Amino acid sequence: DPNLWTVKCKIGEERATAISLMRKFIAYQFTDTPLQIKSVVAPEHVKGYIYVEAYKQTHVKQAIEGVGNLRLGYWNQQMVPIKEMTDVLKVVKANLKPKSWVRLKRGIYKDDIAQVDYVEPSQNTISLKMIPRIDYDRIKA
């Protein structure tokens, strides 16, 4: 079975790296220098490095040449055991379902639990249930 290798990357750029790699593979697949990579895993919970699937280290070493994003993680290629070939794909509870409880960060109701009512298909705004905390305009000027 193929092996899974690890390569360092910048913090906050994981989907961009994935799409760039996809574009490079699609653009350099009918040439004399194809990429032997099988697949790359970019979990959402992790942020700071990405994974890559390949048999040998030379494959990914020669496959990440020229890219300016993976330059940092180019002089070291770590190998993980075979037991770690299934925990990377695990996800602990996406996270968008009506009639569920969610919390807020900005606004005035900071660090408070709420409840979802309706979701707009436009993916721009979503309703929310919460009890008001204002003073009803009696204390403020």
Partner 1 sequence: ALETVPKDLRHLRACLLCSLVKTIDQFEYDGCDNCDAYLQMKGNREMVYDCTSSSFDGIIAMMSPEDSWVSKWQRVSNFKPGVYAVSVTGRLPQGIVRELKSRGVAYKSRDTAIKT
Tell me how far, at minimum, the Cβ of 19 lies from partner 1, in Å.
6
Q: What Å distances lie between residue 95 and 18, 88, 101, 102, 129, CA to CA?
A: 22, 18, 10, 9, 17
60-99 residues in contact with partner 1 (CB under 8 A) are 85-86, 89-97
- 7: nearest Cα among 68, 61, 85: 61
3-state secondary structure of 102: strand
5-44 residues in contact with partner 1 (CB under 8 A) are 15-16, 18-19, 21-23, 25-26, 37-44
Tell me how far, at minimum, the Cβ of 37 lies from partner 1, in Å.
7
Determine the Cα angle at 9 with ends 84 and 72, to 5°.
120
Contacting partner 1 (CB under 8 A), which of 6, 10, 53, 71?
A: 53
Residues that bind partner 1 (CB under 8 A): 1-2, 15-16, 18-19, 21-23, 25-26, 37-44, 53, 85-86, 89-97, 121, 123
